[PDB]
Structures are given as structure tokens and as C-alpha cells.
Amino acid sequence: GKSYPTVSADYQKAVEKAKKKLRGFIAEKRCAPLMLRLAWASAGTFDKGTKTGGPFGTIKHPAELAHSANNGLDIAVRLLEPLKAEFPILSYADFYQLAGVVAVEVTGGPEVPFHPGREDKPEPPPEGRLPDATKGSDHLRDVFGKAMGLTDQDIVALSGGHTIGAAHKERSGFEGPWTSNPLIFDNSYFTELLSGEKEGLLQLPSDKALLSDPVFRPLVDKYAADEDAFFADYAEAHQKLSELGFADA
Numbered sequence: 450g451k452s453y454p455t456v457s458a459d460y461q462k463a464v465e466k467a468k469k470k471l472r473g474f475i476a477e478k479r480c481a482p483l484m485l486r487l488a489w490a491s492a493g494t495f496d497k498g499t500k501t502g503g504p505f506g507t508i509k510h511p512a513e514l515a516h517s518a519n520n521g522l523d524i525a526v527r528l529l530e531p532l533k534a535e536f537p538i539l540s541y542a543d544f545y546q547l548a549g550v551v552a553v554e555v556t557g558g559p560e561v562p563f564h565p566g567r568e569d570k571p572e573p574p575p576e577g578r579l580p581d582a583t584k585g586s587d588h589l590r591d592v593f594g595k596a597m598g599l600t601d602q603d604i605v606a607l608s609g610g611h612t613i614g615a616a617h618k619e620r621s622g623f624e625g626p627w628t629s630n631p632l633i634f635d636n637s638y639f640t641e642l643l644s645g646e647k648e649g650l651l652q653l654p655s656d657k658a659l660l661s662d663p664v665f666r667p668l669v670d671k672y673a674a675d676e677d678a679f680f681a682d683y684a685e686a687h688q689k690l691s692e693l694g695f696a697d698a
């Protein structure tokens with residue numbers, strides 16, 4: 450359903466150069482997870498019915514950073530500002546999504562296709578669209594399905610993003626990494642989810658909800674057994690997420 454906009458040769462040169470610079474920066478700074486979170490929080494506010502929110506640069510706005518779900522993302526925005534300044538031609542919208550794509554790549558994840566052309570929109574969406582970590586399958590479908598317009602498969606695959614990073618008690622209140630290798634992008638999230646609670650490792654109620662849902666569970670099983678399958682489905686889902694409301698959604 451996508452019709453991507455034309456951008457100038459200079460714009461595409463900048464995308465390519467920014468991609469390289471983001472790789473070096475994100476790797477050096479060890480901030481891939483935070484950058485993936487930033488891209489996800491930018492995109493996850495999309496409401497299909499109204500065509501509001503989504504990956505349009507609004508996360509840099511103090512008002513959106515102030516959303517409780519976005520605690521700590523001001524760090525991400527600040528970290529990227531010097532780099533972004535080297536690429537004045539790029540939208541913040543594109544830049545943040547590019548950072549998310551690079552975050553997955555540099556941690557060993559699939560190469561998520563990237564298309565430029567998102568415009569920076571003036572108004573952040575209303576607070577409260579990002580999912581609540583204490584809720585379950587019904588809530589996930591409301592947020593990802595009814596609002597964003599993503600599939601059940603996309604929900605499980607994208608939850609796999611927690612294969613990198615950690616929660617922080619000063620941000621969400623939850624604490625610690627989901628995996629033994631929080632800077633490595635692999636299918637370990639699903640492996641850990643299946644094996645039960647292991648000390649030192651996090652499972653949110655929202656993660657656990659995948660285990661009991663009739664549709665989500667076989668996908669968890671699939672991804673734990675087949676990392677290639679996870680990578681394919683993850684790449685598809687991340688692309689869709691990064692393009693919500695963009696070039697038709």
C-alpha cells in the first residue's frame with residue numbers, strides 16, 4: 450500500500466552518509482537499545498482512524514518527551530542532536546527512524562528496508578497511545594491493531610525488540626535486561642520468555658501476555674525455534690512500524 454515520495458539526490462546522499470555516521474556513533478555510545486526505543490516511541494503513536502501521530506519527528510518536542518511512557522528518551526534526543534546538525538537536509542522524522550534501523554543493524558539484527566521522505570509535523574499526538582506494560586493481549590491488540598493498524602504477527606515480532614536493552618527503575622519502574630546479551634539482536638527474548646523467569650532477567654506482564662494468547666503463542670514458539678523466521682518477520686514489522694501514516698497508512 451506504499452507510494453514513497455521522491456526526494457532529491459542530495460537528500461539520498463545525506464541518508465547514506467547519516468546511516469554510516471549513525472552506525473559508528475550508536476556502536477561507540479552503546480545506545481542502540483535507547484535509539485530503537487526512540488524510533489518505536491516515535492512511530493507507536495499512530496492512530497489509523499484519524500491519521501494522527503506516528504513517525505513524524507514530534508518526539509523531539511518537550512511536550513512529547515514529557516509523556517510518562519517516554520521517560521529517559523530526552524537522553525536519546527540529546528545524544529542525536531550533534532549528529533542531526535551535520536545533516537540539516539534530513540527531517541527529524543527520517544533521522545530518528547534511520548537511527549532505529551541502524552540500531553537493529555549494528556547489534557546484529559536484520560537489515561530493515563528504509564525509505565526517506567517523512568515530513569516533520571508541528572503537533573505531537575495526545576499522550577496515552579503507547580502500550581501499558583502491565584496490561585495484556587486485549588490491550589496490545591487495541592494499540593497495535595485498532596490504533597496502529599499492525600497485525601498479530603507484527604505484535605509478537607516487534608515485542609522481540611526487547612532482545613536488546615533493559616528497563617530502568619527511574620524510567621518505567623521496571624528494571625533490568627530481558628536477555629543475557631542486551632546489546633546483541635537475536636531471538637533470545639523468545640527463548641527467555643519460554644524458559645520461565647530466570648534471576649537477573651526481566652519479563653513485563655505485556656511480554657508474558659504473548660505466552661497465553663492462542664495467536665501469539667505459536668509465533669513465540671516459531672521465533673524461539675527459528676531465528677531466521679524471527680528476523681524476516683521482525684524486518685517486515687519494523688519496516689511497517691517505521692512507515693505508519695507515511696506514503697499511505
Ligand code: HEM
Pocket residue numbers: 481482483485486489521580581582583589607608609610611613614615616617618620621622623653655687
Ligand atoms: C509490546 C508493547 C510494549 C511495551 C508494553 C513496552 C514497554 C517497555 C518498557 C516499560 C520499557 C522500559 C523503559 C525503561 O524503563 O527504560 C521498554 C524498553 C524498551 N523497549 Fe519496549 N515496549 C513495547 C514494545 C516495544 C517495541 C515494539 C519495540 C521496538 C521494536 C521496543 C523496544 C524497546 C527497547 C529497545 C527498550 C530498551 C531501552 C533501553 O535499553 O534503554 N518496545 N519497553
Ligand SMILES: N=NC(=O)c1ccncc1
Pocket residue numbers: 478479480483524528
Ligand atoms: N542510557 N543512556 C545512554 O544510552 C547513554 C547516555 C550518554 N552517553 C552514552 C550512553
Ligand SMILES: N=NC(=O)c1ccncc1
Pocket residue numbers: 486490517518519520579580581582620621
Ligand atoms: N511507562 N511506559 C514505558 O516506559 C514504555 C512503554 C512502551 N515502550 C517503551 C517504554
